[PDB]
Amino acid sequence: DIQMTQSPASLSASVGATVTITCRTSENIDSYLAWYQQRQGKSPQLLVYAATNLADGVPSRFSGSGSGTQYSLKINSLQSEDVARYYCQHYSTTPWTFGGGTQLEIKRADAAPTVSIFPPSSEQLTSGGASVVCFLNNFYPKDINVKWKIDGSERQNGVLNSWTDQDSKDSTYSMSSTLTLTKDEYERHNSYTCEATHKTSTSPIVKSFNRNE
Amino acid sequence: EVQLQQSGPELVKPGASVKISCKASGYSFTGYYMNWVKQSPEKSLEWIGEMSPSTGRTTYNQNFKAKATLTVDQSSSTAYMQLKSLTSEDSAVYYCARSVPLTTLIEDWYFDVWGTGTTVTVSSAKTTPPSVYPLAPGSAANSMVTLGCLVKGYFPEPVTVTWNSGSLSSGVHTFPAVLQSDLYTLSSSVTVPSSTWPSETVTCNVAHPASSTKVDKKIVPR
Structure with missing residues (x-):
């Protein structure tokens, strides 16, 4: 098995930038190499074959080069629709193998999160469960940390977080954090706080509600 | 015009088998090789193997030899893949993917059209x-x-x-x-x-x- 190593794992650049992704192989593959793009939630598409041949219909800002054990994919004037994972693949000796992928993001201006917090619904409380949800929406850069506080004490157990991929219109990220408790433990307390650290604020971003007040 | 419509998502028990389908449109189905690729939850890509829809001739990635069987139905322009004795390792998105015509002397073995994907979940x-x-x-x-x-x-x-x-x-x-x-x-x-x-x-x-x-x-x- 030929090892295909891509770098960097992650790339961030401004719209209009020229960017280069590299693929290093364990053997001289004599340019028997393909590049693919895959957008979130979509099937891959072919960009380049024989290391340097642009697949038909592919935008001309894409190009490939290389020889021996080192190959590159280049995008001139990066566009927001270029946000995707990129993979190299050899077809030199069987079995054909792929690199681990490179994820490209658009670099934009810092954006502070819009934070909303929700107490459990009456519906959920009837089941004997209680989820508190925090949305942290439309922020940039992606780096964020969320902590939950109950009556001021940090709570870590029962916390589930997920992040959207970068937005195709505004290039921001959003995050959702859900703390699930029992109805019983939820009712023993008053103050529920979603607390974030993000580069757009010096101090922690604090969103709370009082059950009830 | 060229499309590769795959079968729906699957939940299978950690011992069972599953057969995935890949329906071809907008080209001569028996004129081009058909490949299969695994994409793990970690988003790595693995080539499973290739089938010729024309002659039935087949080449496997040895890592999948015990796991995968590729089959064909020329009447309906459909390629199949069965995965046997499934474990958690097999939970993944599986793609069918078209490669070059059977008449190529050229040495270019790229996947130019990828299927819609079939998500397989194996658990109890x-x-x-x-x-x-x-x-x-x-x-x-x-x-x-x-x-x-x-x-x-x-x-x-x-x-x-x-x-x-x-x-x-x-x-x-x-x-x-x-x-x-x-x-x-x-x-x-x-x-x-x-x-x-x-x-x-x-x-x-x-x-x-x-x-x-x-x-x-x-x-x-x-």
């Missing part, structure tokens, strides 16, 4: 329908208001969420599902002008095909 966890919970504020009159739906305690993936039957799509954030103890939680937020809510209806629509369930939840104040 029980199919469970979603609970859908409304997320509404308690603040009255920002100029924008954020509403949400929390979809909890379901298995397997996928759940799909729309707002107002898809007619409300700007300002929506639907978050990737998170697994805990064999059950998923997903959320979705929607931001609307405060002039439009609560004076107008906002509903999240949740579909969970695995459990044959659709839920609508109107978001009301308080």
Whole structure:
């Protein structure tokens, strides 16, 4: 098995930038190499074959080069629709193998999160469960940390977080954090706080509600 | 024009087998090789093997020799892949992918058209329908208001969420599902002008095909 190593794992650049992704192989593959793009939630598409041949219909800002054990994919004037994972693949000796992928993001201006917090619904409380949800929406850069506080004490157990991929219109990220408790433990307390650290604020971003007040 | 329509998502028990289909359109099916690729949850890509739809001739990645069997039906322009004795390692998205014509002297073995993908889940966890919970504020009159739906305690993936039957799509954030103890939680937020809510209806629509369930939840104040 030929090892295909891509770098960097992650790339961030401004719209209009020229960017280069590299693929290093364990053997001289004599340019028997393909590049693919895959957008979130979509099937891959072919960009380049024989290391340097642009697949038909592919935008001309894409190009490939290389020889021996080192190959590159280049995008001139990066566009927001270029946000995707990129993979190299050899077809030199069987079995054909792929690199681990490179994820490209658009670099934009810092954006502070819009934070909303929700107490459990009456519906959920009837089941004997209680989820508190925090949305942290439309922020940039992606780096964020969320902590939950109950009556001021940090709570870590029962916390589930997920992040959207970068937005195709505004290039921001959003995050959702859900703390699930029992109805019983939820009712023993008053103050529920979603607390974030993000580069757009010096101090922690604090969103709370009082059950009830 | 060239399309490769694959079969639906699968939940299979950790001993069973599954057969995936790949229907070809807009080209001469028996004129080009057909390949299969695994994509692990970690988003790595693995070549499983190749089949010739014309002659039945086949080449496997030796790592999949015990796992995969590739088959064909020329009458319907459909290629198949069966995966035997499934384990957690086999939970993945599987793609069929077209390569070059059988008449190529050229040495270019690229995958130029990829299928729609078939997600395979292997586990002993029980199919469970979603609970859908409304997320509404308690603040009255920002100029924008954020509403949400929390979809909890379901298995397997996928759940799909729309707002107002898809007619409300700007300002929506639907978050990737998170697994805990064999059950998923997903959320979705929607931001609307405060002039439009609560004076107008906002509903999240949740579909969970695995459990044959659709839920609508109107978001009301308080």
